[PDB]
Amino acid sequence: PTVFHKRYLKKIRDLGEGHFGKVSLYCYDPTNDGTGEMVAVKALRSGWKQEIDILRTLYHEHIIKYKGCCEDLQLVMEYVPLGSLRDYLPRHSIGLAQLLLFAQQICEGMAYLHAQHYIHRDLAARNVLLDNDRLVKIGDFGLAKAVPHEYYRVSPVFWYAPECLKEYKFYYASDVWSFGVTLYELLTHCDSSQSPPTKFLELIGIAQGQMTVLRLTELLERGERLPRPDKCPCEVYHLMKNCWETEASFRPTFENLIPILKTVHEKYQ
Numbered sequence: 001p002t003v004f005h006k007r008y009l010k011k012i013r014d015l016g017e018g019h020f021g022k023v024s025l026y027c028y029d030p031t032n033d034g035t036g037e038m039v040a041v042k043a044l045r046s047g048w049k050q051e052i053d054i055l056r057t058l059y060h061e062h063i064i065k066y067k068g069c070c071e072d073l074q075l076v077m078e079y080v081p082l083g084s085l086r087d088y089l090p091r092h093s094i095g096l097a098q099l100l101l102f103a104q105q106i107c108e109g110m111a112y113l114h115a116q117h118y119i120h121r122d123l124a125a126r127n128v129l130l131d132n133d134r135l136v137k138i139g140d141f142g143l144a145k146a147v148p149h150e151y152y153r154v155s156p157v158f159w160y161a162p163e164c165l166k167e168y169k170f171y172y173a174s175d176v177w178s179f180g181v182t183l184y185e186l187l188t189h190c191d192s193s194q195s196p197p198t199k200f201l202e203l204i205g206i207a208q209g210q211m212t213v214l215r216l217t218e219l220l221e222r223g224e225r226l227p228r229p230d231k232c233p234c235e236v237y238h239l240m241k242n243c244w245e246t247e248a249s250f251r252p253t254f255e256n257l258i259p260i261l262k263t264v265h266e267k268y269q
């Protein structure tokens with residue numbers, strides 16, 4: 001039942017490019033009548049095996065469902081046709097309350113992941129999938145690692161805390177910084193023109209590209225941050241800034257954020 005066979009799997013289309021692999025849509029049809037379920041299949045070496053071993057362990061309402069494996073090994077997951085928040089939000093006017101629900105849902109999945117002693121390492125809107133209108137699922141565990149220790153010794157730098165950029169140490173609290181950035185993306189409706197790379201490169205400029213990471217590190221340590229999104233309530237932006245505390249230990253955990261987001265969700269609903 002965990003094993004899928006190459007002969008009964010037929011390709012429909014490519015879905016995208018993740019960390020250490022391409023994601024493709026297949027229909028898995030043993031019966032030969034298109035009755036069988038549609039599945040997302042990710043394909044590749046050392047780190048690839050790790051993504052299979054990680055996601056095999058994980059089971060949660062807001063983590064993408066592992067279905068099985070296949071001999072090319074390939075990783076078979078549930079298919080979520082609505083795709084990512086990065087894809088979805090630019091075309092669908094979604095209200096503030098729904099966005100906060102998604103935010104709550106991300107933290108519940110991340111709180112689960114951390115309790116299993118894993119860090120994600122690319123928590124970004126491109127890796128948050130919609131199952132349905134009020135159900136996010138976190139995808140792409142290609143950079144995910146098992147914490148040995150308080151951190152893993154290590155790249156999407158515009159989502160990364162100063163300690164990752166400077167000291168090459170990824171903490172549980174580093175994922176919370178990234179969540180802060182993801183929350184910024186949701187509140188801008190994942191608008192390209194307001195994206196973290198666009199905004200940070202406006203602040204840094206591109207006259208000296210060899211020192212992008214240095215200049216990014218320096219501005220963050222100066223206390224400069226991404227602006228408040230249009231129509232974002234002040235309360236919510238403070239929560240963002242709390243996730244972007246320079247000192248990692250002053251950031252809330254994902255367990256701390258859940259009841260806060262529940263209450264903020266209930267306010268604007």
Ligand SMILES: O=C1N=Cc2nc(-c3c(F)cccc3F)cc(Nc3ccc(C(=O)N4CCCC4)cc3)c21
Pocket residue numbers: 014015016017018019023040064077078079080081082083084087126127128129139140
């Ligand atoms: O269903 C899935 N099961 C796992 C998984 N992973 C990803 C994924 C990821 F999480 C991170 C990075 C890259 C990825 F591909 C995406 C994905 N569903 C997708 C659904 C629709 C489109 C699509 O039709 N698009 C997109 C642009 C407009 C056209 C594409 C992908 C799934």
